[PDB]
Design a protein around this ligand. Structure first.
Ligand SMILES: O=C(O)CCC(=O)C(=O)O
Ligand code: NI
Length: 318
């Protein structure tokens, strides 16, 4: 009883010293750069396997998109094409608001209307963001495929597979993607503008809070009003209620024990965002990006993460 108490402290002390031990060993202080694409072997040994991020330069110039993709170009090329647009009152789709996890209001708008809202020629309630992931580029904007590649060759050879998804990203400067993780090896390419990433290694998990949230979706009405409507067709989704920009260190003090990485990834640059890595995404106004999702390898590293996630829960560490 008094010994069960001291053992729990020994369990927590191990969990609380793990992120500092793991990051001293595996995680670099700053995000390193590659001047040109790595070899498939180098890419796997140096980055994929040890779960390390890096920005890769000079790997997107065989894409015509780098020279062509202006806001005017999208209008002239795919303006009349209708795409899925996220609409949110504040620019935070897929985020914790109050005691709800809130999903964006989805909209079928022409690209030209989206461009108008960004350019000032038109106005819209809330904030817009073309951010339907699940492979929106080949699905909704296939005409743009002729300006890019359908995959990243050297990485497809390295990971030994083809991308599960190729996504299109076009957003307002006020459109922000909150802290989360995916089970994908992510190669993030920006064609115009610039993306600002706040990264956390998966080993920082014991200092990053999760909770179970009743899910809901913004409903945009004719009066330009967003109302949070409960979706009673899905069990709670776990999400991070922490804003890394302005952390609530009174309620999540242990987040100060975690350390974030920062990197601005620019036009013609490619970021290797490793699987299970936490990221928080900001963008310049009218930023255009394309990312490739390769499904992660479900090996010991994944099983390990599941354990220590469960352990973080059982010890009430957050
Ligand atoms: O650019 C964003 O807003 C988020 C994109 C993202 O998180 C991803 O790499 O899948
Ligand atoms: Ni993501």
């Amino acid at each position: 009883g008094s010994m069960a108490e001291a053992a729990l402290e020994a369990v927590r002390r191990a969990l609380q010293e793990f992120p500092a031990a793991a990051r001293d060993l595996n995680v670099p202080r700053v995000v390193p750069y590659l001047d040109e694409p790595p070899s498939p072997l180098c890419f796997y040994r140096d980055w994929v396997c040890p779960n390390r991020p890096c920005i890769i330069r000079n790997a997107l110039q065989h894409w015509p998109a780098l020279q062509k993709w202006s806001l005017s170009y999208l209008r002239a090329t795919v303006g009349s094409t209708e795409v899925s647009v996220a609409v949110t009152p504040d620019g935070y789709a897929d985020a914790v608001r109050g005691d709800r996890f809130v999903m964006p209001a989805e909209r079928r708008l022409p690209i030209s209307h989206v461009l108008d809202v960004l350019e000032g020629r038109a106005q819209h309630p809330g904030v817009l963001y073309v951010q339907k992931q699940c492979s929106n580029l080949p699905t909704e904007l296939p005409q743009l495929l002729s300006d890019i590649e359908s995959h990243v060759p050297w990485a497809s050879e390295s990971l030994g597979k083809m991308p599960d998804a190729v996504n299109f990203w076009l957003g307002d400067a006020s459109a922000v993607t909150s802290l989360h993780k995916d089970h994908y090896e992510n190669l993030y390419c920006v064609v115009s503008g610039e993306k600002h990433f706040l990264l956390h290694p998966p080993s920082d998990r014991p200092f990053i809070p999760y909770n179970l949230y009743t899910p809901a979706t913004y409903q945009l009405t004719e009066e330009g009003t967003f109302r949070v409507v409960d979706e009673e067709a899905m069990e709670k989704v776990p999400w991070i209620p922490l804003d890394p920009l302005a952390p609530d260190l009174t309620q999540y003090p242990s987040y100060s024990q975690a350390q974030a990485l920062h990197c601005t990834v620019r036009a013609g640059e490619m970021l290797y965002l490793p699987a299970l890595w936490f990221h928080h995404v900001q963008q310049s106004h009218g930023c255009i990006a394309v990312n490739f999702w390769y499904d992660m390898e479900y090996d010991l590293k994944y099983s390990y993460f599941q354990l220590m996630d469960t352990l973080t829960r059982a010890t009430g560490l957050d």
